Design a protein around this nucleic acid. Structure first.
Ligand code: MG
Ligand code: MG
Ligand code: MG
Ligand code: MG
Ligand code: MG
Ligand code: MG
Ligand code: MG
Ligand code: MG
Lengths: 79, 99, 127, 206, 114, 100, 151
RNA sequence: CGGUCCGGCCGGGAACUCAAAGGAGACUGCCAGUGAUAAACUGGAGGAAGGUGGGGAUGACGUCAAGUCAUCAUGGCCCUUACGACCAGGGCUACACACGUGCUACAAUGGCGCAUACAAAGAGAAGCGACCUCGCGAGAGCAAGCGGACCUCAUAAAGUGCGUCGUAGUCCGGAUUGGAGUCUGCAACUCGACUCCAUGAAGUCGGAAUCGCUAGUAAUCGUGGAUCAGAAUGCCACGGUG
């Protein structure tokens, strides 16, 4: 998928993950950064990942590490 | 040593007519002149859609023939160097001077 | 002096040199059998040496550039016959009959716009 | 049906290029946009000056613009008054130094661009299209034209249904490459739309 | 004949006989025979019980048959429980990798029905 | 095309020579050197802080007169339609209808 | 072929025995423009056919060809809305070309290991007139003797 | 020919291949038959080429209020603190289905392994990128030449020789999916290409019906290019066999 020379993460979301650890668990973290790889320092947080219209809150688990935030936010409605 | 001139022009009856001037000016002012060597013509081809919308099979095909001429003057005589320097060549002909 | 003849078929161009003595064939510094892996290609270069007799009468030094197997093989056939008339000129009559003097002007036709190939038109649909 | 551009098809046969300069793939894009821009200025500035053609050549790192005009006096001005102001901004547009030459168009009634532009300027003055065409044809033939054809398309005289009307006199062989055919277009921007003008002038073979 | 994952290899050539196991393709079969010191163009006949077990011990290194099937099935289930795009597509039986669904998707979808 | 869409490209060009020509290229080649810094660089992070329009891959090749994003040809810098118009007027040097 | 009355292209003879009839045969069998592999199947079949029939390679072919060679055929013609099959005597050149065409098509429809074997066994079956190829001449015969009134 | 590191590679040679400017040549001209002694056709000679030699470009008056106000231009209309404009994320890639155009198949005229002969036409400095080195590999590091008949992309593949499989859903066929990666790009979740390992669907030649093609054509086999940061089974172009 991506070259082994550094996984990607948005600085605005990375600083939001840093602010949430020290200040303690808050309300769902409203972010549009779907292109970021999940790091171990995220497990237990509630991240609100955009789908195009609404922010989908996804509880970060240990198995979710390595995967992208946009995988847990379906973009197209089908019924 | 040896002076190498490379000529490039899109028109053929313009390149060999400007080459005829360079060869004649050099052989008259006493120098050993090799060529006009006719190097291969690079034919750049372009196929464009002729309709402003749809109609795929209808097309206009054009080319850009880049003619080449190589003239090698063996004797770098001052009488030949200055004569070739003050030569009014055609504007649409590129001259590449190799030492 | 060497007896020369140029022969061409398709994009192949063959140069033929004739010198009397033996039945040797040298193609691009290689043997006749070593260059052509098909015997059908070997017999076409032998064809000009059937009507005009040769078993060990004259040698041939040949070089061919471009094309393919039958392209090269066909070009050499045209060169031998051109080098043969260079040597005699009375052989013309025998070489016209066999049709080896004729340059095969059949070239691969250009790809045309709107067509899948040179002539192959894409599948038509009514509805 | 659809005809081939009379000028385009005759390039290299009997018709010459409007751009004789040479360049590589590198600056061919940059020179072509510079050629547009320089033509854009001069067609806009010398609109009333009756400009028929514009030839651009690039000798080394310079630009040699050859303006073909029916009114050279107004293009030149008061002893190089107008030539100097043009050459100044042409050198600014092109980047490289400029040199402008003026070519005299003897019989303008035989130049396609000037005939088309006359018809266009006439339509915008509220003249009858039929009168404009008939005069263009008569003027051309009496001055030695071997043939002429003039076409005017769209909302003629202001009519709601667009028409395509044309007049032709003499010989107009559009298939002979040998034939000297001077073709040009012009657009008349009327109060009721755009009217296209197409002119063909046959000057003889070879 | 009988190797690791119960399967009974036919009496064909060594390289093709070993591809019968689930988890061993053309490359693995070549690497197993190269490590055990056996020829690729030799049949099961002449290959004594002393040459069979050395290949069984060689093939024992990589996950094969029933052990491999559950491993693939575990990685598929993992995606489904996670709730990711990849899992939801295994759950819906449709092209996971990104292939078009408007047409030609009959491998994953199954044969069509009105 | 739109005047705003034409303007957008001017912005993408101006920013392409400002950063991703003399500064961002220096931190991209740095994010490739195996010999120096295998963890503590922040170069991948500071590339994000730079404007998006600065990336050269973000620019679209548009017709130099009309602004058409499709049917472009680099040699002339125009769209297939304006290439035909200028070719037929003889404004394109050495270009003519070819046959073989 | 409405106005233009064309002749027939004269192909070069066989590189082995110099037969124009075998050169037509190799071309009929030939596929995807592979003459090299085409004559390779025709010579291997002839070698295995002449050996297993009592030599005379050119003659063993002729015996198999004489049984598949047709004398008459039907021609589709709509006169009054109705399609009538008119029996027409086939020319000698087309006689051989059809005979060869059915040998190649009958061998292709066979279940043997190789095309050189499929061809050889079809030429053997035709030499004794008991195959798919001879049946195609038989079906063409019954079709002609039936519509014998519209000749 | 003189000299051999056996490479046109170096003196040289302007013969030849080729390159690209100019020119000749084919016109039913000659002979014969047919035909109103005509037009023309048929056949023959000579000729590299024969009856517009092969291919292209070239599309009359007009027809369909045919297609394009989304290339652009433009009459009129409509919005003008919004139908304008900037930005992040998403969509154009959705999927019960139906139709059109293609690719790849169903195999021994074939699959696989090793050895090996012969093209053409293109592209290239914000580029083509050798050699060397590392990696099974996609690639990576290092770094020549070349704005190019010089250097690079780039090993043509069918074909040929030998060996294997032996009519088996198979050593056919590659879909689908699992795991691990590479590269471009701020960034490959939606939604890139490619590789490595594993997986091994359907399909054993297609109903009614229907398409292309008259010769270097069909059929088949590879090669290049435009657009393009990256993304071809499409398109445009090239020769090989035939
Ligand atoms: Mg297996
Ligand atoms: Mg605008
Ligand atoms: Mg882009
Ligand atoms: Mg010539
Ligand atoms: Mg004509
Ligand atoms: Mg309508
Ligand atoms: Mg396979
Ligand atoms: Mg036809």
């Amino acid at each position: 998928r991506s070259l082994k020379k550094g996984p990607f993460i948005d600085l605005h979301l990375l600083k939001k993950v840093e602010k949430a650890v020290e200040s303690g668990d808050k309300k769902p973290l409203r972010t549009w950064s779907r292109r970021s790889t999940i790091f171990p320092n995220m497990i237990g947080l509630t991240i609100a990942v955009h789908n195009g219209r609404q922010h989908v809150p996804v509880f970060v688990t240990d198995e979710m590490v390595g995967h992208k935030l946009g995988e847990f936010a379906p973009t197209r409605t089908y019924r | 040593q040896r002076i190498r001139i490379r000529l490039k022009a899109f028109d053929h009856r313009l390149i060999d007519q400007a080459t005829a001037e360079i060869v004649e000016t050099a052989k008259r002012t006493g120098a050993q002149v090799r060529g006009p060597i006719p190097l291969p013509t690079r034919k750049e081809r372009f196929t464009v859609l002729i309709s402003p919308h749809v109609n795929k099979d209808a097309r206009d095909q054009y080319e850009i023939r880049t003619h080449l001429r190589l003239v090698d003057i063996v004797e770098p005589t001052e009488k030949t160097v200055d004569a070739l320097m003050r030569l009014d060549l055609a504007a649409g002909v590129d001259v590449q001077i190799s030492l | 002096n060497q007896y020369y003849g140029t022969g061409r078929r398709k994009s192949s161009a063959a140069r033929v040199f004739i010198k009397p003595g033996n039945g040797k064939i040298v193609i691009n510094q290689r043997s006749l059998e070593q260059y052509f892996g098909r015997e059908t290609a070997r017999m076409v270069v032998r064809q000009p040496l059937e009507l005009v007799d040769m078993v060990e009468k004259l040698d041939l030094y040949i070089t061919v550039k471009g094309g393919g197997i039958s392209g090269q093989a066909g070009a050499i056939r045209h060169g031998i016959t051109r080098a043969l008339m260079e040597y005699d000129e009375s052989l013309r009559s025998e070489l016209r009959k066999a049709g080896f003097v004729t340059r095969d002007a059949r070239q691969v036709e250009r790809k045309k716009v709107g067509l899948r190939k040179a002539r192959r038109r894409p599948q038509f649909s009514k509805r | 049906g659809q005809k081939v551009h009379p000028n385009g098809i005759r390039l290299g046969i009997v018709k010459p290029w409007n751009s004789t300069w040479f360049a590589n793939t590198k600056e061919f894009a940059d020179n072509l946009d510079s050629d547009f821009k320089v033509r854009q200025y001069l067609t806009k500035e010398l609109a009333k000056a009756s400009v028929s053609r514009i030839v651009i050549e690039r000798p080394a790192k310079s630009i040699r613009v050859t303006i073909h005009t029916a009114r050279p006096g107004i293009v030149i001005g008061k002893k190089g008054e107008d030539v100097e102001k043009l050459r100044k901004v042409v050198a600014d547009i092109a980047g490289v130094p400029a040199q402008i030459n003026i070519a005299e168009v003897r019989k303008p009634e035989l130049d396609a661009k000037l005939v088309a532009d006359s018809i266009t300027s006439q339509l915008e003055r509220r003249v009858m299209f039929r009168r404009a065409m008939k005069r263009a044809v008569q003027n051309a033939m009496r001055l030695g034209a071997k043939g002429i054809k003039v076409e005017v398309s769209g909302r003629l005289g202001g009519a709601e249904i667009a028409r395509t009307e044309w007049y032709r006199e003499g010989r107009v062989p559009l298939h002979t490459l040998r034939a000297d055919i001077d073709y040009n277009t012009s657009e008349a921007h009327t109060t009721y739309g755009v009217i296209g003008v197409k002119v063909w002038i046959f000057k003889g073979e070879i | 004949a009988r190797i690791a994952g119960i399967n009974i290899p036919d009496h064909k050539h060594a390289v093709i006989a070993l591809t019968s196991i689930y988890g061993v393709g053309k490359t693995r079969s070549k690497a197993i025979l190269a490590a055990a010191g056996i020829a690729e163009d030799v049949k099961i006949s002449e290959l004594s019980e002393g040459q069979i077990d050395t290949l069984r011990d060689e093939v024992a290194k990589f996950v094969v048959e029933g052990d491999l099937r559950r491993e693939i099935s575990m990685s598929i289930k993992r995606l489904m429980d996670l709730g990711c795009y990849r899992g939801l597509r295994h759950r819906r039986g449709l092209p996971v990798r990104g292939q078009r669904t408007k047409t030609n998707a009959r491998t994953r979808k199954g044969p069509r029905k009105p | 095309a739109k005047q705003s869409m034409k303007a957008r490209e001017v912005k993408r060009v101006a920013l392409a020579d400002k950063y991703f020509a003399k500064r961002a290229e220096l931190k991209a080649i740095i994010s490739d050197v195996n010999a120096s810094d295998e963890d503590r660089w922040n170069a991948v992070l500071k590339l994000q802080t730079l404007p998006r329009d600065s990336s050269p891959s973000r620019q679209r090749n548009r017709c130099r007169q009309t602004g058409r994003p499709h049917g472009f040809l680099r040699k002339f810098g125009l769209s297939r339609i304006k290439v035909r118009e200028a070719a037929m007027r003889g404004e394109i040097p050495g270009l003519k209808k070819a046959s073989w | 072929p409405r106005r233009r009355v064309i002749g027939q292209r004269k192909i070069l003879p066989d590189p082995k025995f110099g037969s124009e009839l075998l050169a037509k045969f190799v071309n009929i069998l030939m596929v995807d423009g592979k003459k090299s592999t085409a004559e390779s199947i025709v010579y291997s079949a002839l070698e295995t056919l002449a050996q297993r029939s009592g030599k005379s390679e050119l003659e063993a072919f002729e015996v198999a060809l004489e049984n598949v060679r047709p004398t008459v055929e039907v021609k589709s013609r709509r006169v009054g809305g109705s399609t009538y099959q008119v029996p027409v005597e086939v020319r000698p050149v087309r006689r051989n070309a059809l005979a060869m065409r059915w040998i190649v098509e009958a061998a292709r429809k066979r279940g043997d290991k190789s095309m050189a074997l499929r061809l050889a066994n079809e030429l053997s079956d035709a030499a004794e007139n008991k195959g798919t190829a001879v049946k195609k001449r038989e079906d063409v015969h019954r079709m002609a003797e039936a519509n014998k009134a519209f000749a």
